[PDB]
């Protein structure tokens, strides 16, 4: 464990050195919730490596740099109402909760992963995270609107339900592209008259599967 954490601190230092982690909030979250806490034992020895790792049901937990990039873009503030689409391991949701300091909602379509995430969260002592079973491409009406919606799987287009569930001034961070595994990281800000889209560049994510994702 001490070994795993020391390797993790090196990872964090690297991200700060590369200018990936640039804010105090994100550094604090990363140091509080290392990725090894969210992966199966057989993968904990690779948790510090800056690339994605496998998780049950054929999915993956994103690479540290990607999670950092997306969190920095989110510019999370205490009290914000956040929705994550694609819970996976529960790692990103834990990081989010550490920054917003309130209830966090995250949705996952695979039952096995919903339980996987809940277990990781409980074991790590996270309390404010609610893991939901469902199709996140439809968002999560019960707690909308949101300050930020972070999608961790790639879509063929921007899901309309996600734009509708954003507070005016809120933002949707999502990988969108014409390929199942190759997308453009888009930051969509909701305005009083429509939206503003900022393209952050190429990324590679597992496909978002659902009504407003890949079918």
């Amino acid at each position: 464990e001490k070994e795993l954490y020391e390797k993790w601190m090196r990872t964090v230092e690297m991200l700060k050195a590369e200018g990936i982690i640039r804010s105090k909030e994100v550094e604090r979250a990363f140091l509080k919730y290392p990725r090894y806490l969210s992966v199966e034992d057989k993968y904990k020895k690779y948790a510090h490596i800056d690339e994605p790792l496998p998780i049950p049901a054929g999915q993956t937990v994103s690479a540290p740099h990607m999670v950092a990039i997306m969190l920095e873009i989110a510019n999370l503030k205490p009290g914000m109402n956040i929705l994550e689409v694609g819970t996976g391991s529960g790692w990103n949701a834990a990081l989010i909760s550490e920054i917003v300091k309130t209830d966090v909602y995250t949705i996952e379509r695979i039952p096995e992963l919903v339980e996987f995430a809940k277990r990781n969260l409980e074991r790590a002592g996270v309390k404010n995270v609610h893991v939901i079973l469902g199709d996140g491409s439809k968002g999560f009406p019960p707690k909308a609107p949101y300050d930020v919606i972070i999608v961790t799987a790639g879509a063929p287009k921007i899901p309309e339900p996600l734009i509708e569930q954003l507070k005016i001034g809120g933002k949707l961070i999502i990988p969108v592209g014409s390929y199942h595994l190759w997308q453009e990281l888009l930051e969509v800000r909701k305005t009083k008259d429509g939206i503003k889209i900022k393209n952050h560049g190429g990324v590679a994510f597992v496909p978002l599967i659902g009504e407003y994702g890949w079918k």
Partner: peptide, 6 residues
């Protein structure tokens, strides 16, 4: 390398 990365 598995898919999420940049």
């Amino acid at each position: 390398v598995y898919p999420x990365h940049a």
